[PDB]
Design a protein around this ligand. Structure first.
Ligand SMILES: *C[C@@]1(O)CC[C@@H](OC(=O)NC(C)C)c2nnn(Cc3ccc(OC)cc3)c21
Ligand SMILES: [Cl-]
Ligand SMILES: [Co+2]
Length: 369
């Protein structure tokens, strides 16, 4: 009936009637000629539509409340000296409990990113990884929760040295300015341009060197679909892209990455993250270890992302060759860590937003960010 400390009560038990709290609700921006969009908020036609999707928005809100409680707990104990494995296991244990993990009905949407320094995304440790979080590290915590395949993608940056404080502010401001710009009929490239303009208004000094903060050109916000983290609409963080448009009822991950490096990421380091190709259909496999592994993936993850550690915990071993086989057949795709140049520093902030008929909801907003 109230949440414990450390948190252990499922979000579903704290809201016994099943109605989960709304995120930050916002009027859409005015149209570019100048007209207002407040009418959506009082329209019967829009209120009807919105109600027809209530159970959906409610599933996102449950997932979002789990994400707020997990991240508040992580900020309380994450410290240099902890191993990356210990941080991810402690976060994931809490997430499993709060989301009340139940197969594909509720669970973890994707592995815990905890990318360091010049690495921006897609690092989680594999077994045996001895990496320890240090005092000068800049660490992107990116973790996802879901209810019925309704995904919260939300991310923040942890530091301990105040030298990064201005970089964190830039990226936060840039992300908030993306969120503000977003709305129905807005051009995706318009959201990108707003993000860029803000991001580059920021100069930062880090150990006696000055930089203008750059958005990472090839990391992008994106639409979200059911059991589909990246559903094909992509949002730049630089100027230049398609001028296509956000539509009513869609869900977006609005993320920005800021960098003191080239502002471009390349694959580097060993792969931890994998995910079935959403568009591959059924493929009969006779090779027995490869068949078994695909069954394990279909059972436990479907089209959601997973990592090596999550196979290990299911009791699978000596599966690397079978995993490679699935990648080589195109059934599974690998997602290796994405890093800017050696020596650079990268930061991230991200929320999930719902483009409801009646209002824009930053479903994952907290008091924290
Ligand atoms: C994978 C990542 O965290 C970072 C990449 C990003 O995709 C893009 O920016 N794509 C461009 C069009 C090149 C992205 N979108 N969602 N996430 C969350 C996530 C997805 C998959 C996964 O494991 C496979 C983990 C996290 C990201
Ligand atoms: Cl400094
Ligand atoms: Co993310």
């Amino acid at each position: 009936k109230v949440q414990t400390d450390p948190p252990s009560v499922p979000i579903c038990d704290l809201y016994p009637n099943g109605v989960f709290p709304k995120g930050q609700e916002c009027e859409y921006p005015p149209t570019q000629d100048g007209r207002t969009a407040a009418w959506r908020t009082t329209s019967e036609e829009k209120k009807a539509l919105d109600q027809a999707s209530e159970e959906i928005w409610n599933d996102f809100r449950e997932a979002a409340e789990a994400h707020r409680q997990v991240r508040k707990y992580v900020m309380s104990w994450i410290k240099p000296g902890m191993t990356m494995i210990e941080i991810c296991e402690k976060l994931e244990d809490c997430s499993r409990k709060l989301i009340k993990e139940n197969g594909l009905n509720a669970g973890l949407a994707f592995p815990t990113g905890c990318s360091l320094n010049n690495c921006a995304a897609h690092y989680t440790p594999n077994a045996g990884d001895t990496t320890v979080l240090q005092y000068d590290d800049i660490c992107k915590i990116d973790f996802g929760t879901h209810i019925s395949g309704r995904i919260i993608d939300c991310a923040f940056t942890v530091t301990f040295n105040p030298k990064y404080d201005t970089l964190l502010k830039a990226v936060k401001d840039a992300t908030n300015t993306g969120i503000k710009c977003a709305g129905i009929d807005v051009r995706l490239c318009d959201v990108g341009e707003a993000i860029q303009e803000v991001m580059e208004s920021y100069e930062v000094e880090i150990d006696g060197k000055t930089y203008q903060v750059k958005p990472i050109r090839n990391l992008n916000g994106h639409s979200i679909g059911q059991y589909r983290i990246h559903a094909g609409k992509t949002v730049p963080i630089v100027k230049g892209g398609e001028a296509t448009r956000m539509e009513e009822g869609e869900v977006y991950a609005i993320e920005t990455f800021g960098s003191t490096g080239k502002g471009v990421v390349h694959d580097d380091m060993e792969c931890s993250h994998y995910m079935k190709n959403f568009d591959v259909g059924h493929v009969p496999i006779r090779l027995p270890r490869t068949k078994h592994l695909l069954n394990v993936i279909n059972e436990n993850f479907g089209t959601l992302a997973f990592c090596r550690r999550w196979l290990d915990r299911l009791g699978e071993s000596k599966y690397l060759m079978a995993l490679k086989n699935l990648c080589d057949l195109g059934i599974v795709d690998p997602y290796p860590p994405l890093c800017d140049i050696k020596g650079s520093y990268t930061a991230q902030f991200e929320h999930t937003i719902l483009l409801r008929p009646t209002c824009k909801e930053v479903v994952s907003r907290g008091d924290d960010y």
